[PDB]
Each structure stands twice: as C-alpha cells, then as structure tokens.
C-alpha cells in the first residue's frame, strides 16, 4: 500500500 | 532473503498541455505489482502482478484515493518549487519521489527511507532516524521547516514502521510462489577473435532473479578491470534479468582467465573457463 498525508505541501 | 517494498513517483509539468503527468509504480524486490498513470484510461491503481489481483475492491479504490491525493499535492508542489527557484512558467519540471521499507527473512522491520528530487537533483530526504530531514538547498530548507511545523516526519515513520512493513509481509506470502523464488543465472561463455593477436571472451548470465549479481573476471587468480566491459543488468521481460562481462585477452592466453558468477540462487559461486 502507498503512503498518504506526509505534510500539507512543500 | 531480505525483501523490500518500494514506490516510485514521477510528476512532470507540461505547460499549456494540461495538468502535469503523474506515474506511480510499486515494486516488491525486482517485481512490479501496482501502477498508476494519470494519462491512462483507468484513472485507478492497477495490478501488474498476479498475486495482487486477489485483493478486494476496498483495497483498490482506497489505493486509488490515496495515490490520486498524492498526485494532486504533487501538482501544487510543482507550482510552488517553481516559485522557490524563480523559474518561468513556460518550463517543464520534474518531481521524483521514492520511499519504501525493508524486512528480513524473519519478517522484522529493517529500515525505512524516503527521498524527493527536483529536476533530477536531490531536494529533501528523510534521515535515518526517521525523525528529521535534510534539505539539499535553501529552497528545500523552506520545505523542511514546513514539514517540521507539520510533523511530516512522524506521518512518514508511522507508515514505514506501520502498514508498509505489514502489507509487505502480506504481499510476500500471497506471492510466495514467485516472490520468494530463486532463479539462478544460466551461464555460458563465448569467444570472438578481434585480431591476429587479441580475442574477446564474454561471460553470460541469463534468466536470474533477483537482479543482484556480481560477475568477476580473473587472470592468474587476480581481478582484472582493464580491458573489461560490464553492461548494466537488463530485464529480460519475463521477470528475469540478464548481464554479461567481457574481456579482451592475447590469443592463446584465453585459458589463464576465469569468470566468476555469484548470485543469491547460487549457494556456491559458478566459475567459467574457456575450453
């Protein structure tokens, strides 16, 4: 499965 | 042996030709099993391996929902990094992302990683403690602070220590009859005269999996590197891989040279001589 979230943008 | 699950994302802007392209591929060892293409007809996550096709419908639309979310944030990230580097909106730029998790033969977590790129150069990378970041330039240090303020390092670690390691195990048992196979390389040597004085010996390795393999040439029991050519390990297309290593020797001296083949499927290394 893939990761979601991880931040709110770069 | 030890196994790894790895995902590879690519986002390429194409100004005036629609929204950026997004391609996602997932691998277990050297075995691709899932795919996503924003330019494809499905617009969903798609299977690329038999053992993943047995997942319920709830698996696919959740894997689509999450990977589409990533592609939408990859699109805004392209417009933001364009501003960081003060680039024109006419240029095309690429964001690449790789992450994954490794497990051992016992199933224990071994390692997690994530690294992002911009235009083929490093951008930001997760550190080994999975709690900090490393920025490659002052543009990425703005992202680093955005991610520290957002606690992005713990979201990534909860996945790397969580569902990554667990779903990698599930994949490894469902595809056990192909994922845990060991195909040893089928080896043979060829000989082509170069001149009245020199000849080329080519050491072949075919049909091996996984793709990791070391091909050695030795004269008199010592390693040789001059007069050597070694091609990148290439896929055969049927799930196996190929590679060869050549050396040019004085004619008549072919027998002083030995090719050594080491691979996971070979408990004992293979040795090849010209005869």
């Amino acid at each position: 499965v893939v990761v979601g979230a991880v931040g709110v943008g770069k | 042996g030890s196994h790894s699950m790895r995902y590879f994302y690519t986002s390429v802007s194409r100004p005036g030709r629609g929204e950026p392209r997004f391609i996602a591929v997932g691998y277990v060892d050297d075995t691709q099993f899932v795919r996503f293409d924003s330019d494809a007809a499905s617009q969903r996550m798609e299977p690329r391996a038999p053992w993943i096709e047995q997942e319920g419908p709830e698996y696919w639309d959740q894997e689509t929902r999450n990977v589409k979310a990533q592609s939408q944030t990859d699109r805004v990230d392209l417009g933001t990094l364009r501003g960081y580097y003060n680039q024109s909106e006419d240029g095309s730029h690429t964001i690449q992302i790789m992450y994954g998790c490794d497990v051992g033969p016992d199933g224990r977590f071994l390692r997690g990683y994530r690294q992002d790129a911009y235009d083929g150069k490093d951008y930001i990378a997760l550190n080994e403690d999975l709690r900090s970041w490393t920025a490659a330039d002052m543009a990425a240090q703005i992202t680093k602070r955005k991610w520290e303020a957002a606690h992005a390092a713990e979201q990534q670690r909860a996945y790397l220590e969580g569902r990554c390691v667990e779903w990698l195990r599930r994949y490894l048992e469902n595809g056990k009859e192909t994922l845990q196979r060991t195909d040893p390389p089928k080896t043979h040597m060829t000989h082509h005269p170069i001149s009245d004085h020199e000849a080329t010996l080519r050491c072949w390795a075919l049909g091996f999996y996984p793709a990791e393999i070391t091909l050695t040439w030795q004269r008199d029991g010592e390693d040789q590197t001059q007069d050597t050519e070694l091609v990148e390990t290439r896929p055969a297309g049927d799930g196996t891989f190929q590679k060869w290593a050549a050396v040019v020797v004085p004619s008549g001296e072919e027998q002083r040279y030995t090719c050594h083949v080491q691979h996971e499927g070979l408990p004992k290394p293979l040795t090849l001589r010209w005869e």
């Binding site: - | 590879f8 690519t10 390429v12 391609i23 591929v25 691998y27 691709q32 795919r35 293409d37 690329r48 095309s92 730029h93 690429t94 690449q96 790789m98 790129a117 235009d119 083929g120 150069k121 490093d122 060829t190 082509h192 080519r202 075919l206 091609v231 990148e232 290439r234 896929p235 055969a236 297309g237 049927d238 190929q242 060869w244």
Partner: protein, 100 residues
C-alpha cells in the same frame, strides 16, 4: 538544470533461433528528463504495436524503460532501436547484435 543521455541495449529475451518465436528488447536507461521516444525498427521501418514498461528510475534519479515486441528472427531481417531525447543532437540508432 542537469540532463543525462540515455544508455541503450538491444537484445532478445531468449537466445535467438531463426524461425522460432521470441521477444525483441530495447532497454533505455540512465536518462533525464523522462520525455523520450523509442522506436523498434525492422529493415529500417518502424515496428508498430511496440509496448513499453511503466516509468521508473534508479537511485541517481535517472529514468529507465523497456520497449519490447514479439518477433521471429530470420537470416534476412535486420532489427534496430531508434532513440531520440533532448540530450541527443541526433537520434541514435543501435543495431541488434545476436551476442550482445
């Protein structure tokens, strides 16, 4: 920004035998950016129906792709792979060698 020229390998899936079915492989790798056109050639003419793998890259971020098609080698048919990329001043032709 940096760019990388593609490495090219032209080869068959199985050892080539005249008359027997096989697969013709052209493996392009080590290039950046990912925009690339790759054609398989039969006696200089473009082979239609060629399929390629899904995009992915290596550790140094350089991309790699496998273009392939089902074919039957004969003694009279010459095969080649044509690659064009922004890094190239002209498209590079690599001819299929049966022992390479």
């Amino acid at each position: 920004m940096i760019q990388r020229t593609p490495k090219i390998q032209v080869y068959s899936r199985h050892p080539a035998e005249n008359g027997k079915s096989n697969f013709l492989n052209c493996y392009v790798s080590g290039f950046h950016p990912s925009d690339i056109e790759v054609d398989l050639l039969k006696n200089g003419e473009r082979i239609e129906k060629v399929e390629h793998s899904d995009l992915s890259f290596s550790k140094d971020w350089s991309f790699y792709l496998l273009y392939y098609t089902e074919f039957t080698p004969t003694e009279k048919d010459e095969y080649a792979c044509r690659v064009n990329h922004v890094t190239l001043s002209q498209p590079k032709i690599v001819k299929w060698d049966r022992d390479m």
